[PDB]
Amino acid sequence: GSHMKKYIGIRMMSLTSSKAKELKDRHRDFPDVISGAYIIEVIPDTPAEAGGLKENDVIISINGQSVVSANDVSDVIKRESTLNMVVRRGNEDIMITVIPEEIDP
Amino acid sequence: DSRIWWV
């Protein structure tokens, strides 16, 4: 153990069958899929807010990868230095780039 | 479940 587990300053969870379905019941504006990470909250001082994301979207891809759950997003943040998550807004797809930070307690 | 990942 020396340098591992990056830091982006954001909370994400694995959209389980329960939650994934709970969203469709509440906000009837999400696709018919059940794979991807859900954004919980973002700290006012992190690459997340600086990159151009929000705590009301859903991750799916990253730097040319397919994410399904939070566990998948984590390894990516610590595996890839450059993160390129695509977020769909309105009726067009957009590419978001966020660079994590290094930190060790 | 929740399962929050503060990454």
PDB file of N, CA and C in Angstrom:
ATOM      1  N   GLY A   1       0.828  -1.238   0.000  1.00  0.00           N
ATOM      2  CA  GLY A   1       0.000   0.000   0.000  1.00  0.00           C
ATOM      3  C   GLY A   1       0.843   1.261   0.000  1.00  0.00           C
ATOM      4  N   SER A   2       0.612   2.124  -0.983  1.00  0.00           N
ATOM      5  CA  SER A   2       1.356   3.373  -1.094  1.00  0.00           C
ATOM      6  C   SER A   2       0.523   4.441  -1.796  1.00  0.00           C
ATOM      7  N   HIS A   3       0.241   4.219  -3.075  1.00  0.00           N
ATOM      8  CA  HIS A   3      -0.547   5.162  -3.859  1.00  0.00           C
ATOM      9  C   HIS A   3      -1.685   4.450  -4.584  1.00  0.00           C
ATOM     10  N   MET A   4      -2.889   4.556  -4.033  1.00  0.00           N
ATOM     11  CA  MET A   4      -4.060   3.921  -4.627  1.00  0.00           C
ATOM     12  C   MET A   4      -5.340   4.631  -4.198  1.00  0.00           C
ATOM     13  N   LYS A   5      -6.428   4.359  -4.910  1.00  0.00           N
ATOM     14  CA  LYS A   5      -7.716   4.971  -4.602  1.00  0.00           C
ATOM     15  C   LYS A   5      -7.645   6.488  -4.738  1.00  0.00           C
ATOM     16  N   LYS A   6      -7.996   6.990  -5.917  1.00  0.00           N
ATOM     17  CA  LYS A   6      -7.975   8.426  -6.173  1.00  0.00           C
ATOM     18  C   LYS A   6      -9.106   9.124  -5.426  1.00  0.00           C
ATOM     19  N   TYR A   7      -9.235  10.432  -5.634  1.00  0.00           N
ATOM     20  CA  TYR A   7     -10.278  11.207  -4.972  1.00  0.00           C
ATOM     21  C   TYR A   7     -10.859  12.264  -5.906  1.00  0.00           C
ATOM     22  N   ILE A   8     -12.173  12.210  -6.105  1.00  0.00           N
ATOM     23  CA  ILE A   8     -12.858  13.166  -6.969  1.00  0.00           C
ATOM     24  C   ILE A   8     -13.795  14.066  -6.169  1.00  0.00           C
ATOM     25  N   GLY A   9     -14.065  13.684  -4.922  1.00  0.00           N
ATOM     26  CA  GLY A   9     -14.943  14.473  -4.080  1.00  0.00           C
ATOM     27  C   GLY A   9     -16.397  14.379  -4.498  1.00  0.00           C
ATOM     28  N   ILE A  10     -16.925  13.160  -4.527  1.00  0.00           N
ATOM     29  CA  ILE A  10     -18.314  12.939  -4.909  1.00  0.00           C
ATOM     30  C   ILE A  10     -18.813  11.586  -4.412  1.00  0.00           C
ATOM     31  N   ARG A  11     -20.115  11.497  -4.167  1.00  0.00           N
ATOM     32  CA  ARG A  11     -20.721  10.260  -3.691  1.00  0.00           C
ATOM     33  C   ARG A  11     -21.515   9.580  -4.801  1.00  0.00           C
ATOM     34  N   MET A  12     -21.227   8.304  -5.030  1.00  0.00           N
ATOM     35  CA  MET A  12     -21.917   7.539  -6.063  1.00  0.00           C
ATOM     36  C   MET A  12     -22.326   6.168  -5.534  1.00  0.00           C
ATOM     37  N   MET A  13     -23.473   5.679  -5.994  1.00  0.00           N
ATOM     38  CA  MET A  13     -23.976   4.379  -5.562  1.00  0.00           C
ATOM     39  C   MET A  13     -24.301   3.492  -6.757  1.00  0.00           C
ATOM     40  N   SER A  14     -24.378   2.186  -6.512  1.00  0.00           N
ATOM     41  CA  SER A  14     -24.685   1.227  -7.564  1.00  0.00           C
ATOM     42  C   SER A  14     -26.190   1.090  -7.749  1.00  0.00           C
ATOM     43  N   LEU A  15     -26.691   1.589  -8.876  1.00  0.00           N
ATOM     44  CA  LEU A  15     -28.116   1.525  -9.172  1.00  0.00           C
ATOM     45  C   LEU A  15     -28.611   0.082  -9.172  1.00  0.00           C
ATOM     46  N   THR A  16     -29.037  -0.391  -8.006  1.00  0.00           N
ATOM     47  CA  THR A  16     -29.535  -1.753  -7.871  1.00  0.00           C
ATOM     48  C   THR A  16     -30.941  -1.875  -8.453  1.00  0.00           C
ATOM     49  N   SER A  17     -31.394  -3.111  -8.644  1.00  0.00           N
ATOM     50  CA  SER A  17     -32.719  -3.371  -9.201  1.00  0.00           C
ATOM     51  C   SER A  17     -33.795  -2.564  -8.479  1.00  0.00           C
ATOM     52  N   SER A  18     -33.628  -2.394  -7.171  1.00  0.00           N
ATOM     53  CA  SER A  18     -34.588  -1.646  -6.367  1.00  0.00           C
ATOM     54  C   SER A  18     -34.546  -0.157  -6.701  1.00  0.00           C
ATOM     55  N   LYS A  19     -33.408   0.473  -6.435  1.00  0.00           N
ATOM     56  CA  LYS A  19     -33.242   1.899  -6.702  1.00  0.00           C
ATOM     57  C   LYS A  19     -33.502   2.219  -8.172  1.00  0.00           C
ATOM     58  N   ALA A  20     -32.870   1.461  -9.062  1.00  0.00           N
ATOM     59  CA  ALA A  20     -33.032   1.667 -10.498  1.00  0.00           C
ATOM     60  C   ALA A  20     -34.507   1.721 -10.887  1.00  0.00           C
ATOM     61  N   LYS A  21     -35.309   0.864 -10.268  1.00  0.00           N
ATOM     62  CA  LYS A  21     -36.739   0.816 -10.548  1.00  0.00           C
ATOM     63  C   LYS A  21     -37.478   1.924  -9.805  1.00  0.00           C
ATOM     64  N   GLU A  22     -36.939   2.322  -8.656  1.00  0.00           N
ATOM     65  CA  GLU A  22     -37.547   3.374  -7.849  1.00  0.00           C
ATOM     66  C   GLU A  22     -37.531   4.708  -8.588  1.00  0.00           C
ATOM     67  N   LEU A  23     -36.477   4.937  -9.363  1.00  0.00           N
ATOM     68  CA  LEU A  23     -36.338   6.175 -10.122  1.00  0.00           C
ATOM     69  C   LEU A  23     -37.378   6.255 -11.234  1.00  0.00           C
ATOM     70  N   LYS A  24     -37.578   5.142 -11.932  1.00  0.00           N
ATOM     71  CA  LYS A  24     -38.546   5.087 -13.022  1.00  0.00           C
ATOM     72  C   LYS A  24     -39.948   5.418 -12.523  1.00  0.00           C
ATOM     73  N   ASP A  25     -40.241   5.015 -11.292  1.00  0.00           N
ATOM     74  CA  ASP A  25     -41.549   5.268 -10.696  1.00  0.00           C
ATOM     75  C   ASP A  25     -41.703   6.743 -10.334  1.00  0.00           C
ATOM     76  N   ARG A  26     -40.621   7.346  -9.857  1.00  0.00           N
ATOM     77  CA  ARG A  26     -40.637   8.754  -9.474  1.00  0.00           C
ATOM     78  C   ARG A  26     -40.446   9.650 -10.692  1.00  0.00           C
ATOM     79  N   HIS A  27     -39.238   9.638 -11.245  1.00  0.00           N
ATOM     80  CA  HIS A  27     -38.924  10.447 -12.416  1.00  0.00           C
ATOM     81  C   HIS A  27     -39.045   9.623 -13.694  1.00  0.00           C
ATOM     82  N   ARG A  28     -40.197   9.723 -14.351  1.00  0.00           N
ATOM     83  CA  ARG A  28     -40.434   8.986 -15.585  1.00  0.00           C
ATOM     84  C   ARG A  28     -39.782   9.690 -16.771  1.00  0.00           C
ATOM     85  N   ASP A  29     -38.464   9.836 -16.706  1.00  0.00           N
ATOM     86  CA  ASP A  29     -37.713  10.487 -17.774  1.00  0.00           C
ATOM     87  C   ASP A  29     -36.362   9.808 -17.991  1.00  0.00           C
ATOM     88  N   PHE A  30     -36.200   8.612 -17.430  1.00  0.00           N
ATOM     89  CA  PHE A  30     -34.955   7.866 -17.569  1.00  0.00           C
ATOM     90  C   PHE A  30     -35.130   6.694 -18.531  1.00  0.00           C
ATOM     91  N   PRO A  31     -34.049   6.292 -19.219  1.00  0.00           N
ATOM     92  CA  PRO A  31     -34.090   5.178 -20.173  1.00  0.00           C
ATOM     93  C   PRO A  31     -34.691   3.917 -19.564  1.00  0.00           C
ATOM     94  N   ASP A  32     -34.767   2.857 -20.363  1.00  0.00           N
ATOM     95  CA  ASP A  32     -35.322   1.589 -19.902  1.00  0.00           C
ATOM     96  C   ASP A  32     -34.213   0.619 -19.508  1.00  0.00           C
ATOM     97  N   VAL A  33     -33.082   1.165 -19.075  1.00  0.00           N
ATOM     98  CA  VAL A  33     -31.947   0.346 -18.666  1.00  0.00           C
ATOM     99  C   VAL A  33     -31.864   0.249 -17.147  1.00  0.00           C
ATOM    100  N   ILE A  34     -30.944  -0.576 -16.660  1.00  0.00           N
ATOM    101  CA  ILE A  34     -30.766  -0.755 -15.224  1.00  0.00           C
ATOM    102  C   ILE A  34     -29.285  -0.818 -14.850  1.00  0.00           C
ATOM    103  N   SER A  35     -28.426  -0.370 -15.761  1.00  0.00           N
ATOM    104  CA  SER A  35     -26.987  -0.374 -15.521  1.00  0.00           C
ATOM    105  C   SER A  35     -26.437   1.047 -15.500  1.00  0.00           C
ATOM    106  N   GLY A  36     -25.516   1.306 -14.579  1.00  0.00           N
ATOM    107  CA  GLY A  36     -24.925   2.624 -14.468  1.00  0.00           C
ATOM    108  C   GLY A  36     -24.816   3.088 -13.030  1.00  0.00           C
ATOM    109  N   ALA A  37     -24.054   4.154 -12.809  1.00  0.00           N
ATOM    110  CA  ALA A  37     -23.871   4.694 -11.467  1.00  0.00           C
ATOM    111  C   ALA A  37     -24.738   5.928 -11.249  1.00  0.00           C
ATOM    112  N   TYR A  38     -25.268   6.065 -10.039  1.00  0.00           N
ATOM    113  CA  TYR A  38     -26.116   7.200  -9.698  1.00  0.00           C
ATOM    114  C   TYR A  38     -25.357   8.207  -8.840  1.00  0.00           C
ATOM    115  N   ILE A  39     -25.417   9.476  -9.231  1.00  0.00           N
ATOM    116  CA  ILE A  39     -24.738  10.532  -8.488  1.00  0.00           C
ATOM    117  C   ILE A  39     -25.559  10.941  -7.270  1.00  0.00           C
ATOM    118  N   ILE A  40     -24.916  10.959  -6.107  1.00  0.00           N
ATOM    119  CA  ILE A  40     -25.593  11.321  -4.867  1.00  0.00           C
ATOM    120  C   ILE A  40     -25.382  12.793  -4.521  1.00  0.00           C
ATOM    121  N   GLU A  41     -24.153  13.152  -4.169  1.00  0.00           N
ATOM    122  CA  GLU A  41     -23.838  14.532  -3.816  1.00  0.00           C
ATOM    123  C   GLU A  41     -22.424  14.898  -4.250  1.00  0.00           C
ATOM    124  N   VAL A  42     -22.205  16.184  -4.501  1.00  0.00           N
ATOM    125  CA  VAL A  42     -20.897  16.669  -4.924  1.00  0.00           C
ATOM    126  C   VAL A  42     -20.400  17.781  -4.008  1.00  0.00           C
ATOM    127  N   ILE A  43     -19.124  17.709  -3.637  1.00  0.00           N
ATOM    128  CA  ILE A  43     -18.527  18.712  -2.768  1.00  0.00           C
ATOM    129  C   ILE A  43     -18.157  19.963  -3.574  1.00  0.00           C
ATOM    130  N   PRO A  44     -18.483  21.160  -3.049  1.00  0.00           N
ATOM    131  CA  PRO A  44     -18.218  22.440  -3.728  1.00  0.00           C
ATOM    132  C   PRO A  44     -16.761  22.648  -4.154  1.00  0.00           C
ATOM    133  N   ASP A  45     -15.851  21.798  -3.685  1.00  0.00           N
ATOM    134  CA  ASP A  45     -14.440  21.942  -4.035  1.00  0.00           C
ATOM    135  C   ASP A  45     -13.834  20.625  -4.510  1.00  0.00           C
ATOM    136  N   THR A  46     -14.142  20.248  -5.748  1.00  0.00           N
ATOM    137  CA  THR A  46     -13.615  19.015  -6.330  1.00  0.00           C
ATOM    138  C   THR A  46     -13.703  19.059  -7.852  1.00  0.00           C
ATOM    139  N   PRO A  47     -12.965  18.171  -8.540  1.00  0.00           N
ATOM    140  CA  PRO A  47     -12.973  18.108 -10.002  1.00  0.00           C
ATOM    141  C   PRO A  47     -14.371  17.827 -10.544  1.00  0.00           C
ATOM    142  N   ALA A  48     -15.199  17.190  -9.720  1.00  0.00           N
ATOM    143  CA  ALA A  48     -16.566  16.861 -10.109  1.00  0.00           C
ATOM    144  C   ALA A  48     -17.355  18.117 -10.465  1.00  0.00           C
ATOM    145  N   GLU A  49     -17.388  19.073  -9.540  1.00  0.00           N
ATOM    146  CA  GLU A  49     -18.109  20.320  -9.763  1.00  0.00           C
ATOM    147  C   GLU A  49     -17.379  21.198 -10.773  1.00  0.00           C
ATOM    148  N   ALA A  50     -16.054  21.090 -10.797  1.00  0.00           N
ATOM    149  CA  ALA A  50     -15.241  21.875 -11.717  1.00  0.00           C
ATOM    150  C   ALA A  50     -15.324  21.324 -13.137  1.00  0.00           C
ATOM    151  N   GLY A  51     -15.520  20.014 -13.248  1.00  0.00           N
ATOM    152  CA  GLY A  51     -15.616  19.385 -14.552  1.00  0.00           C
ATOM    153  C   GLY A  51     -16.883  19.776 -15.288  1.00  0.00           C
ATOM    154  N   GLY A  52     -17.980  19.893 -14.547  1.00  0.00           N
ATOM    155  CA  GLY A  52     -19.245  20.265 -15.151  1.00  0.00           C
ATOM    156  C   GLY A  52     -20.325  19.221 -14.944  1.00  0.00           C
ATOM    157  N   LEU A  53     -20.240  18.486 -13.838  1.00  0.00           N
ATOM    158  CA  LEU A  53     -21.225  17.455 -13.535  1.00  0.00           C
ATOM    159  C   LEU A  53     -22.288  17.990 -12.582  1.00  0.00           C
ATOM    160  N   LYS A  54     -23.048  17.082 -11.977  1.00  0.00           N
ATOM    161  CA  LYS A  54     -24.095  17.467 -11.041  1.00  0.00           C
ATOM    162  C   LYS A  54     -24.546  16.270 -10.209  1.00  0.00           C
ATOM    163  N   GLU A  55     -25.238  16.543  -9.109  1.00  0.00           N
ATOM    164  CA  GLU A  55     -25.725  15.486  -8.231  1.00  0.00           C
ATOM    165  C   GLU A  55     -27.160  15.104  -8.580  1.00  0.00           C
ATOM    166  N   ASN A  56     -27.446  15.021  -9.874  1.00  0.00           N
ATOM    167  CA  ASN A  56     -28.780  14.663 -10.343  1.00  0.00           C
ATOM    168  C   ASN A  56     -28.711  13.980 -11.704  1.00  0.00           C
ATOM    169  N   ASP A  57     -27.595  13.305 -11.967  1.00  0.00           N
ATOM    170  CA  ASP A  57     -27.403  12.609 -13.234  1.00  0.00           C
ATOM    171  C   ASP A  57     -27.029  11.149 -13.001  1.00  0.00           C
ATOM    172  N   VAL A  58     -26.770  10.429 -14.087  1.00  0.00           N
ATOM    173  CA  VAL A  58     -26.404   9.021 -13.999  1.00  0.00           C
ATOM    174  C   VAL A  58     -25.246   8.689 -14.936  1.00  0.00           C
ATOM    175  N   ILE A  59     -24.169   8.154 -14.369  1.00  0.00           N
ATOM    176  CA  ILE A  59     -22.999   7.786 -15.155  1.00  0.00           C
ATOM    177  C   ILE A  59     -23.240   6.481 -15.905  1.00  0.00           C
ATOM    178  N   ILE A  60     -22.483   6.263 -16.975  1.00  0.00           N
ATOM    179  CA  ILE A  60     -22.628   5.051 -17.772  1.00  0.00           C
ATOM    180  C   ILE A  60     -21.301   4.633 -18.394  1.00  0.00           C
ATOM    181  N   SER A  61     -20.596   5.592 -18.984  1.00  0.00           N
ATOM    182  CA  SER A  61     -19.313   5.314 -19.617  1.00  0.00           C
ATOM    183  C   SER A  61     -18.217   6.205 -19.043  1.00  0.00           C
ATOM    184  N   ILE A  62     -16.966   5.797 -19.237  1.00  0.00           N
ATOM    185  CA  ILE A  62     -15.829   6.560 -18.738  1.00  0.00           C
ATOM    186  C   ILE A  62     -14.561   6.250 -19.533  1.00  0.00           C
ATOM    187  N   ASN A  63     -13.998   7.281 -20.162  1.00  0.00           N
ATOM    188  CA  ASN A  63     -12.781   7.138 -20.963  1.00  0.00           C
ATOM    189  C   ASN A  63     -12.827   5.891 -21.845  1.00  0.00           C
ATOM    190  N   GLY A  64     -13.947   5.696 -22.531  1.00  0.00           N
ATOM    191  CA  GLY A  64     -14.093   4.547 -23.405  1.00  0.00           C
ATOM    192  C   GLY A  64     -14.306   3.254 -22.641  1.00  0.00           C
ATOM    193  N   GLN A  65     -15.211   3.285 -21.669  1.00  0.00           N
ATOM    194  CA  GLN A  65     -15.510   2.105 -20.865  1.00  0.00           C
ATOM    195  C   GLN A  65     -16.998   2.040 -20.537  1.00  0.00           C
ATOM    196  N   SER A  66     -17.464   0.856 -20.151  1.00  0.00           N
ATOM    197  CA  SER A  66     -18.870   0.663 -19.813  1.00  0.00           C
ATOM    198  C   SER A  66     -19.040   0.393 -18.321  1.00  0.00           C
ATOM    199  N   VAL A  67     -19.624   1.355 -17.614  1.00  0.00           N
ATOM    200  CA  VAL A  67     -19.848   1.223 -16.179  1.00  0.00           C
ATOM    201  C   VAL A  67     -21.253   0.703 -15.893  1.00  0.00           C
ATOM    202  N   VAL A  68     -21.410   0.019 -14.764  1.00  0.00           N
ATOM    203  CA  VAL A  68     -22.706  -0.533 -14.381  1.00  0.00           C
ATOM    204  C   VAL A  68     -23.068  -0.164 -12.946  1.00  0.00           C
ATOM    205  N   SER A  69     -22.092  -0.255 -12.048  1.00  0.00           N
ATOM    206  CA  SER A  69     -22.321   0.067 -10.643  1.00  0.00           C
ATOM    207  C   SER A  69     -21.202   0.943 -10.088  1.00  0.00           C
ATOM    208  N   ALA A  70     -21.390   1.425  -8.863  1.00  0.00           N
ATOM    209  CA  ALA A  70     -20.400   2.273  -8.212  1.00  0.00           C
ATOM    210  C   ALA A  70     -19.043   1.580  -8.144  1.00  0.00           C
ATOM    211  N   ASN A  71     -19.059   0.294  -7.801  1.00  0.00           N
ATOM    212  CA  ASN A  71     -17.830  -0.486  -7.705  1.00  0.00           C
ATOM    213  C   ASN A  71     -17.046  -0.424  -9.011  1.00  0.00           C
ATOM    214  N   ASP A  72     -17.762  -0.256 -10.118  1.00  0.00           N
ATOM    215  CA  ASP A  72     -17.136  -0.177 -11.430  1.00  0.00           C
ATOM    216  C   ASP A  72     -16.536   1.206 -11.660  1.00  0.00           C
ATOM    217  N   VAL A  73     -17.210   2.229 -11.144  1.00  0.00           N
ATOM    218  CA  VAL A  73     -16.746   3.605 -11.293  1.00  0.00           C
ATOM    219  C   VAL A  73     -15.483   3.855 -10.472  1.00  0.00           C
ATOM    220  N   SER A  74     -15.462   3.320  -9.253  1.00  0.00           N
ATOM    221  CA  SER A  74     -14.321   3.489  -8.359  1.00  0.00           C
ATOM    222  C   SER A  74     -13.020   3.036  -9.018  1.00  0.00           C
ATOM    223  N   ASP A  75     -12.944   1.749  -9.351  1.00  0.00           N
ATOM    224  CA  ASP A  75     -11.751   1.186  -9.980  1.00  0.00           C
ATOM    225  C   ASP A  75     -11.279   2.046 -11.151  1.00  0.00           C
ATOM    226  N   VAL A  76     -12.229   2.620 -11.883  1.00  0.00           N
ATOM    227  CA  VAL A  76     -11.905   3.463 -13.028  1.00  0.00           C
ATOM    228  C   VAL A  76     -11.183   4.733 -12.587  1.00  0.00           C
ATOM    229  N   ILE A  77     -11.706   5.375 -11.548  1.00  0.00           N
ATOM    230  CA  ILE A  77     -11.110   6.601 -11.029  1.00  0.00           C
ATOM    231  C   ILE A  77      -9.694   6.352 -10.524  1.00  0.00           C
ATOM    232  N   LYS A  78      -9.453   5.147 -10.018  1.00  0.00           N
ATOM    233  CA  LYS A  78      -8.139   4.784  -9.500  1.00  0.00           C
ATOM    234  C   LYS A  78      -7.299   4.068 -10.557  1.00  0.00           C
ATOM    235  N   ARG A  79      -7.946   3.625 -11.632  1.00  0.00           N
ATOM    236  CA  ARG A  79      -7.248   2.925 -12.706  1.00  0.00           C
ATOM    237  C   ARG A  79      -6.840   3.888 -13.816  1.00  0.00           C
ATOM    238  N   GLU A  80      -7.763   4.762 -14.204  1.00  0.00           N
ATOM    239  CA  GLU A  80      -7.498   5.732 -15.260  1.00  0.00           C
ATOM    240  C   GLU A  80      -7.314   7.132 -14.685  1.00  0.00           C
ATOM    241  N   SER A  81      -6.217   7.781 -15.062  1.00  0.00           N
ATOM    242  CA  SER A  81      -5.926   9.128 -14.586  1.00  0.00           C
ATOM    243  C   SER A  81      -6.889  10.137 -15.199  1.00  0.00           C
ATOM    244  N   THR A  82      -7.228   9.925 -16.467  1.00  0.00           N
ATOM    245  CA  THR A  82      -8.146  10.812 -17.172  1.00  0.00           C
ATOM    246  C   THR A  82      -9.520  10.163 -17.306  1.00  0.00           C
ATOM    247  N   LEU A  83     -10.537  10.828 -16.771  1.00  0.00           N
ATOM    248  CA  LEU A  83     -11.900  10.310 -16.827  1.00  0.00           C
ATOM    249  C   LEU A  83     -12.749  11.102 -17.816  1.00  0.00           C
ATOM    250  N   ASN A  84     -13.419  10.385 -18.711  1.00  0.00           N
ATOM    251  CA  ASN A  84     -14.274  11.012 -19.712  1.00  0.00           C
ATOM    252  C   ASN A  84     -15.665  10.389 -19.698  1.00  0.00           C
ATOM    253  N   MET A  85     -16.509  10.861 -18.786  1.00  0.00           N
ATOM    254  CA  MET A  85     -17.868  10.347 -18.661  1.00  0.00           C
ATOM    255  C   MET A  85     -18.832  11.127 -19.549  1.00  0.00           C
ATOM    256  N   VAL A  86     -19.714  10.403 -20.230  1.00  0.00           N
ATOM    257  CA  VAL A  86     -20.692  11.024 -21.115  1.00  0.00           C
ATOM    258  C   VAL A  86     -22.048  11.154 -20.432  1.00  0.00           C
ATOM    259  N   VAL A  87     -22.587  12.369 -20.423  1.00  0.00           N
ATOM    260  CA  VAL A  87     -23.884  12.624 -19.805  1.00  0.00           C
ATOM    261  C   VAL A  87     -24.866  13.193 -20.823  1.00  0.00           C
ATOM    262  N   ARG A  88     -26.048  12.592 -20.898  1.00  0.00           N
ATOM    263  CA  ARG A  88     -27.071  13.037 -21.836  1.00  0.00           C
ATOM    264  C   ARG A  88     -27.969  14.100 -21.209  1.00  0.00           C
ATOM    265  N   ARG A  89     -28.004  15.273 -21.831  1.00  0.00           N
ATOM    266  CA  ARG A  89     -28.824  16.375 -21.341  1.00  0.00           C
ATOM    267  C   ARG A  89     -29.773  16.863 -22.431  1.00  0.00           C
ATOM    268  N   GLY A  90     -31.056  16.953 -22.095  1.00  0.00           N
ATOM    269  CA  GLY A  90     -32.042  17.403 -23.059  1.00  0.00           C
ATOM    270  C   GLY A  90     -32.296  16.377 -24.146  1.00  0.00           C
ATOM    271  N   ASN A  91     -31.696  16.593 -25.311  1.00  0.00           N
ATOM    272  CA  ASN A  91     -31.857  15.678 -26.437  1.00  0.00           C
ATOM    273  C   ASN A  91     -30.535  15.488 -27.176  1.00  0.00           C
ATOM    274  N   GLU A  92     -29.428  15.722 -26.476  1.00  0.00           N
ATOM    275  CA  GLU A  92     -28.106  15.581 -27.070  1.00  0.00           C
ATOM    276  C   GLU A  92     -27.116  14.984 -26.075  1.00  0.00           C
ATOM    277  N   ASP A  93     -26.152  14.227 -26.590  1.00  0.00           N
ATOM    278  CA  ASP A  93     -25.139  13.602 -25.748  1.00  0.00           C
ATOM    279  C   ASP A  93     -23.918  14.507 -25.615  1.00  0.00           C
ATOM    280  N   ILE A  94     -23.397  14.622 -24.398  1.00  0.00           N
ATOM    281  CA  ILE A  94     -22.234  15.465 -24.144  1.00  0.00           C
ATOM    282  C   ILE A  94     -21.124  14.680 -23.452  1.00  0.00           C
ATOM    283  N   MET A  95     -19.880  15.031 -23.763  1.00  0.00           N
ATOM    284  CA  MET A  95     -18.727  14.365 -23.170  1.00  0.00           C
ATOM    285  C   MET A  95     -18.123  15.222 -22.062  1.00  0.00           C
ATOM    286  N   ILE A  96     -18.095  14.680 -20.849  1.00  0.00           N
ATOM    287  CA  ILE A  96     -17.545  15.397 -19.706  1.00  0.00           C
ATOM    288  C   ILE A  96     -16.199  14.819 -19.290  1.00  0.00           C
ATOM    289  N   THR A  97     -15.228  15.695 -19.060  1.00  0.00           N
ATOM    290  CA  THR A  97     -13.893  15.271 -18.658  1.00  0.00           C
ATOM    291  C   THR A  97     -13.574  15.743 -17.243  1.00  0.00           C
ATOM    292  N   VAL A  98     -13.177  14.803 -16.390  1.00  0.00           N
ATOM    293  CA  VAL A  98     -12.838  15.121 -15.008  1.00  0.00           C
ATOM    294  C   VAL A  98     -11.558  14.411 -14.580  1.00  0.00           C
ATOM    295  N   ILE A  99     -10.632  15.165 -13.999  1.00  0.00           N
ATOM    296  CA  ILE A  99      -9.366  14.601 -13.547  1.00  0.00           C
ATOM    297  C   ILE A  99      -9.336  14.460 -12.024  1.00  0.00           C
ATOM    298  N   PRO A 100      -9.377  13.218 -11.508  1.00  0.00           N
ATOM    299  CA  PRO A 100      -9.355  12.963 -10.063  1.00  0.00           C
ATOM    300  C   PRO A 100      -8.118  13.545  -9.389  1.00  0.00           C
ATOM    301  N   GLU A 101      -8.068  13.437  -8.065  1.00  0.00           N
ATOM    302  CA  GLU A 101      -6.940  13.954  -7.297  1.00  0.00           C
ATOM    303  C   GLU A 101      -6.314  12.856  -6.442  1.00  0.00           C
ATOM    304  N   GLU A 102      -5.042  13.031  -6.101  1.00  0.00           N
ATOM    305  CA  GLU A 102      -4.329  12.053  -5.286  1.00  0.00           C
ATOM    306  C   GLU A 102      -4.387  12.429  -3.809  1.00  0.00           C
ATOM    307  N   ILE A 103      -4.663  11.442  -2.963  1.00  0.00           N
ATOM    308  CA  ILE A 103      -4.748  11.667  -1.526  1.00  0.00           C
ATOM    309  C   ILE A 103      -4.584  10.360  -0.756  1.00  0.00           C
ATOM    310  N   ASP A 104      -3.812  10.407   0.325  1.00  0.00           N
ATOM    311  CA  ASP A 104      -3.576   9.226   1.147  1.00  0.00           C
ATOM    312  C   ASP A 104      -3.591   9.583   2.633  1.00  0.00           C
ATOM    313  N   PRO A 105      -4.569   9.056   3.394  1.00  0.00           N
ATOM    314  CA  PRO A 105      -4.679   9.330   4.832  1.00  0.00           C
ATOM    315  C   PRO A 105      -3.558   8.675   5.633  1.00  0.00           C
TER     316      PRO A 105
ATOM    317  N   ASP B   1     -30.896  -1.321  -2.269  1.00  0.00           N
ATOM    318  CA  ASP B   1     -29.979  -0.828  -1.210  1.00  0.00           C
ATOM    319  C   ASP B   1     -29.304   0.474  -1.627  1.00  0.00           C
ATOM    320  N   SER B   2     -28.696   1.156  -0.661  1.00  0.00           N
ATOM    321  CA  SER B   2     -28.012   2.416  -0.928  1.00  0.00           C
ATOM    322  C   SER B   2     -26.613   2.168  -1.483  1.00  0.00           C
ATOM    323  N   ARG B   3     -25.699   1.756  -0.611  1.00  0.00           N
ATOM    324  CA  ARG B   3     -24.325   1.484  -1.016  1.00  0.00           C
ATOM    325  C   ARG B   3     -23.670   2.738  -1.591  1.00  0.00           C
ATOM    326  N   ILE B   4     -23.381   3.700  -0.722  1.00  0.00           N
ATOM    327  CA  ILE B   4     -22.753   4.947  -1.144  1.00  0.00           C
ATOM    328  C   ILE B   4     -21.238   4.802  -1.216  1.00  0.00           C
ATOM    329  N   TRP B   5     -20.654   5.296  -2.303  1.00  0.00           N
ATOM    330  CA  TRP B   5     -19.210   5.224  -2.496  1.00  0.00           C
ATOM    331  C   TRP B   5     -18.601   6.619  -2.578  1.00  0.00           C
ATOM    332  N   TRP B   6     -18.188   7.149  -1.430  1.00  0.00           N
ATOM    333  CA  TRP B   6     -17.589   8.477  -1.372  1.00  0.00           C
ATOM    334  C   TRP B   6     -16.202   8.477  -2.005  1.00  0.00           C
ATOM    335  N   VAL B   7     -16.159   8.378  -3.329  1.00  0.00           N
ATOM    336  CA  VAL B   7     -14.895   8.368  -4.053  1.00  0.00           C
ATOM    337  C   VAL B   7     -14.586   9.742  -4.638  1.00  0.00           C
TER     338      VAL B   7
END
